[PDB]
Amino acid sequence: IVGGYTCGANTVPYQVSLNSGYHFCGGSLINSQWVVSAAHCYKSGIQVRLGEDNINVVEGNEQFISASKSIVHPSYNSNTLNNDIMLIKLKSAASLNSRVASISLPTSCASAGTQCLISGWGNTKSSGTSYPDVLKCLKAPILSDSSCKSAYPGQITSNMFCAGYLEGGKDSCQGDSGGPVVCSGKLQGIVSWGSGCAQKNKPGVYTKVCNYVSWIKQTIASN
């Protein structure tokens, strides 16, 4: 997160860290045994670390659970990043409490202007790479589809939405992928792509989860 702030230990109970000997992507717990992340975050031997703040130190509340399977969206396309969404089944159910809680799937899509909270352990610097030990948070509004598609001509599909600031200085960045974009207590987005980080006229592009609410439900229901 570039331009964000320190969330505060366990203040974002649904944030999970995708670890494989290092933090590579983010995710959000939607229930005790299922996590939502980005399809481009997929790799073998994914360990899901819940209840984290400082990813480098063990300070209580962590739950290390291994991915029992990662269900990438059948129609994911690595070039366009369309359908950039992946479900990760946990080997064992996580213990839910005040420090580890699931986030709600939206019932409808959010509107341009809606203030959302984006969080993650991704790069905190646009020009260079500085990673934080603790979870960073950022408040950013969903942009209007016209401003989104104008910034990324022909690259924005109906399953993508822009969130952020056109002036730059505040944006999600590498390491934040798979992370949550929560608006009014509903998981509205998954950190996906963007042209750099916190660059002017280059907002962050996110996976429009409302389009996948039914896919998610059915997939989970059959696994």
């Binding site: 980005a38 990324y152 792509w193």
Partner: peptide, 22 residues
Amino acid sequence: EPCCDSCRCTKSIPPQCHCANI
């Protein structure tokens, strides 16, 4: 030479810059 024009990059560790130059 460099990463095209506006290298569309994923925000993963490490990133995937499939670029935007079509």
